[PDB]
RNA sequence: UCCUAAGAAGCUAUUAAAAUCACC
RNA sequence: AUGUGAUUUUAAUAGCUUCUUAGGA
């Protein structure tokens, strides 16, 4: 009965996740200590021609981007806890995440340091050009 | 089952997937979408937008190792070092029966405390937008082995009052005994699947407001707080737990208690299936042998009662010995040989249980049973300090822990006896009046041969001396016999029971003098 | 000595069914 | 469709390896 969701690669960082008084920081430190990343991210056969954003409806992946979708780009959507936005609301679910392919290894913990620029919609210091 | 885990195993019975974005994982994408390992984003098929979907949190494995974070799970070596923070847990679930199949969401819980703590079937529906933890529809298992959960279905308390009432219980419970809690589970696959929602492991923290570990956590106001300052703090902070069944047990939760204990019983009862896991795990641990070489904390009084059980078992000894003239004094359960009183006449023959890392004294190895040596000894008077014997003898001097009496000290133990954690473990058995059909109650008294030098007039039967005897009582002896009366009362207090032969006379003292 | 087809054996993996054990 | 696993078997399916037969080089 059920649909299986996750793998057994992931049932030690996300069980370890799913009890942390703060997730993201908790998943930063089992990444420096000895962690491999979250697998089994969703990820988009795009055109991969496409101008760069963070957050768009459809996937626009430039040449150095690989776009995934946006519920396995968040930590928290990814661990079933609650999202420390105010509302309670994911801002990432629903929408495409491009994550920047030098760093596309591990999904889950760029959305978790980066940040999205207010004013041009890039990833503010990969891309963002505010000069 | 090809890689995957039946962790957060999507329990809906929509027949339909989920969107490439709005999906958890790759596995979750409905067929539509997955191509070659790469979702493709359909511009015809719309997204979700209403949908719940009841993850299943059953199958977390906690085999982390981070730098800063303690581990839950715990060897039992350092399982038997915490010893006053056992709070024995299981957990009776229910299974989601409509619009959810697949998952047993928490509906009562039971700890070593003896409460049962019911809960509204509750479990984490995968909303658009969020992780709305909310009420599922469930139905209780089938069976009539299950039939006390048909009521519980309609009454409970929603989980932000079994939050509180779990802080609540082990706060007022490991209060004062320890500053951690070792949660003792039977089966550990259900018992995290229900510590999802009370638990909030962490770096290691401290107390605010105070300095002790930090083991309560606050969601409300972002804070810490040992079990003393944890009023209203909800969710238990780093616990740590230990599973009986990976200690190599083969068959039930009953099969396996039900040969070493008669006094617990009514299983797939919450608060006692949780006393048994810890029934059980006490058994394996302690009732073996007493290990000398785990010391323990010290709560409190641990300094002045041992003190005291020494002055007074240095009393009682050489008392009963210049008062009866016994020829040779037997003794058994001394680990090591230390003389009790060393300035007698005496032959000490150490008829101990087992030598215990020396024989420069040629302690002797016997065991003792009722039915077996009753007719053994016979010669002089036995003194069975602190032993565990079924029935005493005809003549000696007993000293038996009264496992009635409840205290800090006293945890609860198996079959009925009781593990007396001072400075050791010990893990007595019950007190019952048939091991002393043989013997009688001590009378209190203080007898010394100390010569009298020269405050209020203290004039009692009790002490056996000769300035008592006369119109004045010294003040060389009333402090004396103050200090001593303080020991026997902080000794009954402590939970012991003094026991003697029947022939014991002590007007037999008088005649010393 | 090498490639292909069929048969047999062994190892591993995927689905299905059955049996045992634990949890409920 | 009514719960969760774990281990064995028993069927198919896939891959690899070994042996036998046939065809070719
Ligand atoms: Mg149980
Ligand atoms: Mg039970
Ligand atoms: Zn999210
Ligand atoms: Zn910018
Ligand atoms: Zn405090
Ligand atoms: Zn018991
Ligand atoms: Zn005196």
């Known amino acids: 009965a059920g649909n299986a969701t996750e793998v057994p690669a992931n049932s030690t960082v996300l069980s370890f996740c799913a009890f942390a008084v703060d997730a993201a920081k908790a998943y930063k430190d089992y990444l420096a200590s000895g962690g491999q990343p979250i697998t089994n991210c969703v990820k988009m056969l795009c055109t991969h021609t496409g101008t760069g954003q963070a957050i768009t409806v459809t996937p626009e992946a430039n040449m150095d981007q690989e776009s995934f979708g946006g519920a396995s780009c968040c930590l928290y959507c990814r661990c079933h806890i609650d999202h420390p936005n105010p509302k309670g609301f994911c801002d990432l679910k629903g929408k495409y995440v491009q994550i920047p392919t030098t760093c596309a290894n591990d999904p889950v913990g760029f959305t978790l340091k980066n940040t999205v620029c207010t004013v041009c919609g890039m990833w503010k210091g990969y891309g963002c050009s505010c000069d | ?513």
């Open chain 2, 1 to 513: 089952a090809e890689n995957v885990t039946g962790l957060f195993k999507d329990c809906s019975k929509v027949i339909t997937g989920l969107h490439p974005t709005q999906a958890p994982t790759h596995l979750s994408v409905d067929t539509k979408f997955k191509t070659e390992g790469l979702c493709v984003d359909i511009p015809g098929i719309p997204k979700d937008m209403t949908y719940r979907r009841l993850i299943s949190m059953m199958g977390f494995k906690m085999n982390y190792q981070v730098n800063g974070y303690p581990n839950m799970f715990i060897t039992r070596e350092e399982a038997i070092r915490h010893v006053r923070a056992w709070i024995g847990f299981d957990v009776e679930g229910c299974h989601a029966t409509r619009e959810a199949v697949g998952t047993n969401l928490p509906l009562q819980l039971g700890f070593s405390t003896g409460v049962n703590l019911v809960a509204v079937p509750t479990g984490y529906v995968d909303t658009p937008n969020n992780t709305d933890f909310s009420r599922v529809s469930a139905k209780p298992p089938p069976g009539d082995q299950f039939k006390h959960l048909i009521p519980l279905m309609y009454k409970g308390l929603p989980w932000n009052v079994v939050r509180i009432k779990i802080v609540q219980m082990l706060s007022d419970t490991l209060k004062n005994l320890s500053d951690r809690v070792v949660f003792v589970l039977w089966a550990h696959g259900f018992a995290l699947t229900s510590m999802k929602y009370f638990v909030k492991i962490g770096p290691e923290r401290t107390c605010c407001l105070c300095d002790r570990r930090a083991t309560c956590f606050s969601t409300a106001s972002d804070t810490y707080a040992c079990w003393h300052h944890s009023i209203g703090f909800d969710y238990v902070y780093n616990p740590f737990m230990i599973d009986v069944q990976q200690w190599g047990f083969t068959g039930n939760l009953q099969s396996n208690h039900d040969l070493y204990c008669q006094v617990h019983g009514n299983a797939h009862v919450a608060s006692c299936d949780a006393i048994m896991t810890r029934c059980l795990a006490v058994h394996e641990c302690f009732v073996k042998r007493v290990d000398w070489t785990i010391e323990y904390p010290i709560i409190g009084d641990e300094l002045k009662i041992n003190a005291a059980c020494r002055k007074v078992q240095h009393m009682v000894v050489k008392a009963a010995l210049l008062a009866d003239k016994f020829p040779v004094l037997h003794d058994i359960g001394n680990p090591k040989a230390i003389k009790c009183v060393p300035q007698a006449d005496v032959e000490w023959k150490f008829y101990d249980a087992q030598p215990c890392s020396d024989k420069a004294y040629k302690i002797e190895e016997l065991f003792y049973s009722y039915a077996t040596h009753s007719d053994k000894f016979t010669d002089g008077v036995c003194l069975f300090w602190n032993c565990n014997v079924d029935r005493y003898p005809a003549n000696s001097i007993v000293c038996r822990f009264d496992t009635r009496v409840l205290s800090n000290l006293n945890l609860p133990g198996c079959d009925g006896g009781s593990l007396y954690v001072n400075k050791h473990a010990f893990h007595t058995p019950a007190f019952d009046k048939s091991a002393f059909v043989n013997l009688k109650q001590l009378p209190f008294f203080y007898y010394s041969d100390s010569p009298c030098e020269s405050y209020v007039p203290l004039k009692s039967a009790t002490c056996i001396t000769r300035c008592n005897l006369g119109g004045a009582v010294c003040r060389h002896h009333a402090n004396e016999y103050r200090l001593y009366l303080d020991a026997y009362n902080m000794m009954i207090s402590a939970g012991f029971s003094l026991w003697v032969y029947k022939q014991f006379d002590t007007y037999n003292l008088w005649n010393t003098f």
